[PDB]
Design a protein around this nucleic acid. Sequence first.
DNA 1: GCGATATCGCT
DNA 2: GCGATATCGCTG
DNA 3: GCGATATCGCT
DNA 4: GCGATATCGCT
DNA 5: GCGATATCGCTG
DNA 6: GCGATATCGCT
Lengths: 199, 199
Amino acid sequence: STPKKNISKGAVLHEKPMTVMVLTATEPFNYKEGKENMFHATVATESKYYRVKVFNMDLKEKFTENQFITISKYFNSSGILEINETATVSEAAPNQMFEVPKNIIRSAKETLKISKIKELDSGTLIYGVFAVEKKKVNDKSITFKIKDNEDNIKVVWDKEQHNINYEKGDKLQLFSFHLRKGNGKPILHSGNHSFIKGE
Amino acid sequence: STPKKNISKGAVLHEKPMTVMVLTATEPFNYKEGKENMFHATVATESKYYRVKVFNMDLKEKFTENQFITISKYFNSSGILEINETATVSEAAPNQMFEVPKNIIRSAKETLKISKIKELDSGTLIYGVFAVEKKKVNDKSITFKIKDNEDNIKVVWDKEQHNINYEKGDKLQLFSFHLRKGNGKPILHSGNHSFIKGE
DNA sequence: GCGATATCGCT
DNA sequence: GCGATATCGCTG
DNA sequence: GCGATATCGCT
DNA sequence: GCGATATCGCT
DNA sequence: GCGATATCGCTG
DNA sequence: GCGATATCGCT
């Protein structure tokens, strides 16, 4: 539809094919409100793991746990792969397949300590699974609090009301949330691509 | 709506107010088919006369024979004033009014000889009043021929079917037509802003 | 077999 | 085909 | 856009 | 008297 | 506010 | 866009 369409500001295009194994992917959902579906994915190589944002819905079938794929003309914004109709995505050839270390996989399912998160620069993109607290409904928002035990952080959802909690004691899983500090006590804020659900 | 909106490629913006008397103006009509009304006007100063294209319909009332106006932030493309919502157009102050020579006025109602027209570079914009010949209807066009007596030139209308002829022996008046030469015998071709009517 | 249209190139 | 003009997307 | 040449199409 | 929203600046 | 990306408008 | 501060508004 357009070369950089749906791509983040300043993302760098990556030329050469890279082959990865899919760990994880979410349902497509909706943003830029009402237009623009996308979905979230985690993939790995032998060396490292990447978080992915997928703007071309045709790719949804290629993204399934443990499936190997080859990507080219994708975009990297600050370490997060972004992918749209401009990229080519193939089912990988066996010769291109490889082993993926337990470490890497452990490492890519792993969630930071709220303590450690708070030492991070403003605007940092946060992902993780968290225990939850009392929510709220506000004319135009929703409010959480989540526990690492050793915190303690508030979470602000600015988007819209659909999803599933989940009868509270269900835990809470976060994609692409924005760290905000300022003068106040810091919080995690919803963003373009933000996604929450029960784990 | 947009600074250069409806303005011709490479038109230069004119900063300082200029004061002119309206000789002539046409009804608004329609182009870029179905969108984009505009209208044609002839105006003069003491020194010279200009052909004008007016894309802001609010200006229609300001343009009436013999009325003096002040224009600023208008555009000149190859000697043809172009005017849109970006320009300012005021009813002129009497101190700004002036005399307009018979010569200039004669000169701006005046039509070239088809002979002399044909020595002109391709793509030149032609205006004039002309005697007419047998027409045609073609699936997607209309064809004329017009006489200066000493020519002899064909005319091609690519636009659409509304206007008034006029029971042939009515004469024919042309705004902003394109001279086309090439290998063939030359012709006058309809364009974006082209307009024909009976005089 | 001519004129009316469609394609090219870049304007 | 390609530069000019308008809209999009939010550092270091 | 638009002008020029290349092709279409009635007959 | 706090949190939820609206505005600013430029990102 | 402003540079980057996409669409607009057709020399010399 | 988005983060930060400035203002709104229930009570």
